[PDB]
Amino acid sequence: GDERFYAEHLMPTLQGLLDPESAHRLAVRFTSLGLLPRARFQDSDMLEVRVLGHKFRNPVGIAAGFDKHGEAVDGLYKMGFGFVEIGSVTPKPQEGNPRPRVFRLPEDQAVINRYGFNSHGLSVVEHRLRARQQKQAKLTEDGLPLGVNLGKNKTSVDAAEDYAEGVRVLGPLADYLVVNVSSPNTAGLRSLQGKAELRRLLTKVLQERDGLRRVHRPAVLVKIAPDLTSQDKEDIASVVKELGIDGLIVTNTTVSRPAGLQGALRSETGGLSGKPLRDLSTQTIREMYALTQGRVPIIGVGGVSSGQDALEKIRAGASLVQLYTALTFWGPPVVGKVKRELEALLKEQGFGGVTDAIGADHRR
Ligand SMILES: Cc1cc2nc3c(=O)[nH]c(=O)nc-3n(C[C@H](O)[C@H](O)[C@H](O)COP(=O)(O)O)c2cc1C
Ligand SMILES: O=Cc1ccccc1/C=N/Nc1nc(-c2ccccc2)cs1
Ligand SMILES: O=C(O)c1cc(=O)[nH]c(=O)[nH]1
Numbered sequence: 001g002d003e004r005f006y007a008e009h010l011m012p013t014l015q016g017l018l019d020p021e022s023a024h025r026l027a028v029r030f031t032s033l034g035l036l037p038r039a040r041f042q043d044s045d046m047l048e049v050r051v052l053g054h055k056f057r058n059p060v061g062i063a064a065g066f067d068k069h070g071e072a073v074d075g076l077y078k079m080g081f082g083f084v085e086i087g088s089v090t091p092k093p094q095e096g097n098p099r100p101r102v103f104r105l106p107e108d109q110a111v112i113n114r115y116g117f118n119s120h121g122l123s124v125v126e127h128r129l130r131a132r133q134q135k136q137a138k139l140t141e142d143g144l145p146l147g148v149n150l151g152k153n154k155t156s157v158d159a160a161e162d163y164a165e166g167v168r169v170l171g172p173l174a175d176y177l178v179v180n181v182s183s184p185n186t187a188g189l190r191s192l193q194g195k196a197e198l199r200r201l202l203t204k205v206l207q208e209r210d211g212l213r214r215v216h217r218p219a220v221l222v223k224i225a226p227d228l229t230s231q232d233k234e235d236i237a238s239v240v241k242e243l244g245i246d247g248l249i250v251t252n253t254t255v256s257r258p259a260g261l262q263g264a265l266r267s268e269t270g271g272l273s274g275k276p277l278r279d280l281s282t283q284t285i286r287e288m289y290a291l292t293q294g295r296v297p298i299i300g301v302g303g304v305s306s307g308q309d310a311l312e313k314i315r316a317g318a319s320l321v322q323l324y325t326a327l328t329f330w331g332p333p334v335v336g337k338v339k340r341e342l343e344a345l346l347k348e349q350g351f352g353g354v355t356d357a358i359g360a361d362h363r364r
Helices: 003-017 020-032 073-078 122-130 133-141 159-173 189-193 195-210 230-243 275-291 307-316 325-330 333-348
Strands: 049-051 054-056 060-062 083-089 102-105 110-113 146-150 176-180 219-224 247-250 271-274 298-301 320-323
Touching (some): 003 325, 003 333, 020 073, 020 102, 083 176, 122 133, 122 159, 133 146, 146 159, 159 176, 176 195, 195 219, 195 230, 219 230, 247 275, 271 325, 307 333, 320 333, 325 333
Parallel strands (some): 060 320, 083 146, 146 176, 247 298
Antiparallel strands (some): 102 110
16 A cells, blocks of 8 residues: 555556556456555544534545446445545436547646446446445444435436436435536536526425435535536525535536646546646635535535645535545555645644634635
8 A cells, every 4th residue: 555656656557558447447346346455544533524414534535436336335435535425326327428438637637537427327326235235324323424426317308307316216325415416528417507497406306305214314415516607606505505405515527628738638528627626626615615604514526636635625615525536646545645644734733623624714
């Protein structure tokens, strides 16, 4: 589990052999088999966070899109993540976009993807989660919660029914559900972020959620884009407070292409993730936290690869953070690296723990 060794030798060699999608499939396979160093970092109490009705023993999660179909959940906890989000999962199985559909931008430490919600579908994922449901219940009680990210099928007419089906089928197996209305890779999906569509969609989602038995009733979060207008953000904040939405995930990938991208593949269609997304995401967190008066838990995501990156999002208003793209460049040791650096920085800056740092920039 040598950070320098994975970063300098292992990851580049696998990247040099495999196209990104093959590398991803292989990584999911290795992870699901537990073929990783069991992370040696023991989580300090400073890293514990209580939010969303749960204890999280550390605030660093794996973002949706890595384990799309719920195959590697246990291997991901073994890697040291404090929580795992699987998905997005669509109601029916679907293949997603034609290949190639994932591209590396090594010079930018970025990735562009246009998977298009390739998904084994609700039924397959439901059976997969059911087979380990009681083990997850113990993990959750031990501070390692599970989130499920819901998508909608390409040919679906009623998006709200797609999401409602997801709540009914996977809601009982999740600590939190994410309504993903921000994928750049499904036509018309992001328009669900608009005020009228969003209110109607989320009213239905919450009704379905509230109809679940108490012990099987997940928190509901909305995952938003980094490309929203100020008007969009105000409207989302308003709907979230009107309806009692439990939290926000901020942010998905960007359809923008920031000035300065060097990668040859920078003009590929898709969502861009990684370092060029980092500060755009951080600023969106800052804005959403202010618009919700610090009362709505935020999971911050986008370009996190270090303790400093994590702490900047936490200070901007995130209670938890996730990463994905960094894992593809640095490998598994990046998880312990982020946690160890985060702990050191919290101590350097005079915080008793993560909880004290949440939103600290707003109180300056
Ligand atoms: C290859 C790939 C697939 C992704 N698939 C999903 C997805 O299915 N659902 C979702 O909500 N986000 C998905 N994401 C977005 C991540 O969850 C995250 O929001 C984004 O990548 C920014 O975080 P990062 O810079 O640490 O990668 C995907 C990202 C990548 C790179
Ligand atoms: O290579 C590009 C890429 C693009 C999209 C999604 C994943 C990847 C590659 N990921 N490579 C990873 N390898 C691991 C890994 C896991 C266990 C042992 C060694 C490496 C985790 S993520
Ligand atoms: O499946 C996708 O392509 C996908 C979904 C999503 O939510 N975000 C992303 O970058 N890609």
